[PDB]
From a paper:
BET proteins bind chromatin through their two bromodomains (BDs), BD1 and BD2, which specifically recognize histones acetylated on lysines. We show that [name] is essential in C. glabrata, and that inactivation of both [name] BDs induces lethality.
Surprisingly, unlike 24 and the other analogs, methylfuryl‐containing compounds 24c and d significantly inhibited CgBD2 in the HTRF assay and inhibited the growth of C. glabrata strains expressing WT [name] and the [name]‐Δbd1 mutant. The crystal structure of CgBD1 bound to 24c revealed that the methyltriazine moiety forms direct and water‐mediated H bonds with BC loop residue Asn209 and ZA loop residue Tyr166, respectively. Shifting the compound's methyl group to a meta position would abolish this contact and (in one of the two meta positions) yield a steric clash with Phe208, explaining the loss of potency for compounds with this configuration. The methlyfuryl ring packs against Pro151 in the RPF shelf, while the methyl group makes a van der Waals contact with Arg150. Considerable space surrounds this moiety in the binding pocket, explaining why its replacement by certain bulkier substituents is well tolerated. Superimposing the structures of 24 and 24a onto that of 24c reveals that the thiophenyl, furyl and methylfuryl groups of these compounds would all clash with the Tyr327 gauche‐ conformation but that only the methylfuryl group would form a favorable contact with the trans conformation, explaining why compounds 24c and 24d, but not the other analogs, inhibit CgBD2. Namely, whereas CgBD residues Arg150 and Tyr327 point away from the binding pocket, the corresponding Brd4 Trp81 and Typ374 side chains point into the pocket and would clash with the compound's methylfuryl group.
Residue numbers in the entry: 126 to 237
The structure:
């Protein structure tokens, strides 16, 4: 069920290093469109994604490929691109943490 334990451990190391980057702050938790008075968020963003959801899918063995993790990350960034604009501060921070995460994933050991 899910990626093998060594792949999962590498991915969790990656996530935990990323969470500690200041650029991660806006993605630590799910966006709360009501707390933030942005009602149009769930109309534009059909699939919200955040670092907490990713981590908890990881622990649940809900990821079958490292590419799924990367895709959820990408989606996390494309959401802010779509709702705040391509050059908003939050979007650039998303891009920065996405770069850091891919960099970490480069060293992802193989299934075998
Ligand atoms: C008026 C406005 C419009 C969009 C957004 C917004 N868009 N995307 C995301 C991922 C996001 N995350 C919440 C967050 C940002 C900073 C911290 C500490 O939490 N907020 C915030 C305010
Ligand atoms: K904006």
């Amino acid at each position: 069920m899910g990626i093998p334990q060594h792949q999962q451990k590498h991915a969790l190391m990656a996530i935990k290093a990323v969470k500690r980057l200041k650029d991660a702050r806006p993605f630590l938790q799910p966006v709360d469109p009501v707390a933030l008075n942005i009602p149009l968020y769930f109309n534009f963003i059909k699939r919200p994604m955040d670092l907490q959801t990713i981590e908890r899918k990881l622990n649940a063995n809900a990821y079958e490929t490292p590419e799924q993790i990367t895709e959820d990350f990408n989606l996390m960034v494309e959401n802010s691109a779509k709702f705040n604009g391509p050059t908003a501060v939050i979007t650039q921070m998303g891009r920065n943490i996405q770069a850091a995460f891919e960099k970490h994933m480069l060293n992802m050991p193989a299934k075998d």
